[model samples]
Target: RNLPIRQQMEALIRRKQAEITQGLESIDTVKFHAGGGTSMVIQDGTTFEKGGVNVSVVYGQLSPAAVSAMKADHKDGVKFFACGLSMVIHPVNPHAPTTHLNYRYFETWNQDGTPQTWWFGGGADLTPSYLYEEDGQLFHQLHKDALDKHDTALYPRFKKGIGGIFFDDYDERDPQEILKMVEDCFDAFLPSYLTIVKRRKDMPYTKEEQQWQAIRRGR
Candidate 1:
């Protein structure tokens, strides 16, 4: 017979903790927080002082009455899994460009342990206070290369996806123009990184570089 739901949940929690520990070690200066009714992990790399990645996993246990109420709204039992990781990196040199990446997975399962439906979603984009055309193009192309390997249509669709999700209505730019700006920004990631690597890869780190790293750390 299948294990009780409570037993299954406990097992899941143990497995996820092991996986998280292994993953965090791959990066530098990462800290893990467990207990106090929340599960959280934060990773910090030495490369960018002011920037780090944070991921939070939340699991809620429903009371029998609450579960009954949820069943009324959602035919399925109250079981779900949601995971997201977000990162923001600010370069010391304002010219270096700020970047953000987020990826997440969410799912809902029936009481019988069968999935009703599931979807995958996440994106990465660049935000530079100043514009750099080539940088924008390179970023888009890198993503294009990855998406094209799976499906040629993905890049264009995801390119538009980020534009729609990240649009800033408060900005003075027109909606259409804002979307174009986002598209341009997404396209610049790879090329921008490439340009930086090509120009500075072999160069020794300078005082300014160190300062930027410190700034990213909120120092």
Candidate 2:
């Protein structure tokens, strides 16, 4: 006997929430915020903004009609769960470049109370408001290493895909070219971070560096 789709979907949703909550708890020193909607910003108390993590979980409540349409695809109940994490590190020294990382996973389950299919996605991208070519290259390369372990083709595909997704305009060019640019950017993430970290890690900070860090978070 097949379980109805709605019952199956509800079970999967409960499982996912439990799994994520458990995993988060094992990590050290995490603060909780209330209000069930759009949580963001994890900051260092002293610096206020220099170092912090940002996480967001956005959910869309499904209507009966929407549920029916999703069931048509899976023949089991359908539910949605989307979550992601983003982090930024701002060092006191201007010489120490700002860095960003984001990674996430998404899945949709079927009405039969089983997982139909799922995929892991998301990448860490570095954005330096100031240009640092070496830093950029290091960041892309590290990401490449991570992707290559799973699928050699993923780095190229994601790189191309993400570039266009991030931008609105690009010289009125072909989509394929835009994709290649994106791929290049993704391939470039790790090396970029490595370069900056290598250059600045051991250097001493000046008074100006301390002040800059203070001002960034409005402290």
Candidate 3:
């Protein structure tokens, strides 16, 4: 807790990116490739066909001209720093989904380089090539409760943003319950979800199921 948010975010992403890549390779159709910022990437891969898990830590000054272009000249004083992990996976299986996981924390500095604004930006995206409404559910909720110390509506807010949904509950549960849910999900993140997909990728599906899957990814 004593560490700066930048350091904390950097460290967390690095560790998660490593674990995620290792697990994906273990489930790979062949081995995977590496090297992308804090995470690893697969521009070329025999490993289940071109997926990447990337981590990043960066800091830079936001120029006046840039702020003006964004119509954010009022924020002209801002400098920026960020850290996070983002991953995309596309299985070789024709029926498997192509999906991504993105999680980030960012800070904006004042004219004097004092940190001013801060926020978290991250979410899970699961696309099935479609039996798995549960696929979307599993990935979306993967970290939803895991970080409920930020109190859980973040995903609901995200869902609202990008043609998404949260079917678990109507609104806030008891505080204790919320924390418990986060704790449970946090514990599960290490040992869960991908295992289900592991089987999904290597396993079989029918033509009918594939048709149903396509219908599921609607406009």
- The sequence of per-residue lDDT tens digits that candidate 2 reaches over residues 51-150 is 4344455444456777666543331344655554444555444455666554433345546254543333344554443345665555556666655654
TM-score of each: 0.51, 0.48, 0.68
Ranking by lDDT: 3, 1, 2
Residues 53-131 of candidate 3: C-alpha lDDT, one tens digit per residue: 8777778877877756754322244688866677777665645566666666666765645456565545555555634
Q: Which residue segments of model 3 deviate by more than 4 Å?
A: 35-39, 43-47, 71-77, 110-114, 147-155, 160-192, 205-219
lDDT of 1 by residue, 87-129 (tens): 5555444445566754443445546464543333456676653
Cα-based lDDT at residue 123, candidate 3: 50
lDDT of each: 0.46, 0.44, 0.56
* lDDT, candidate 3, at 16: 70
Per-residue error at 134 for model 3, in Å?
A: 2.9
Q: RMSD of candidate 2 to the true fold?
A: 10.6
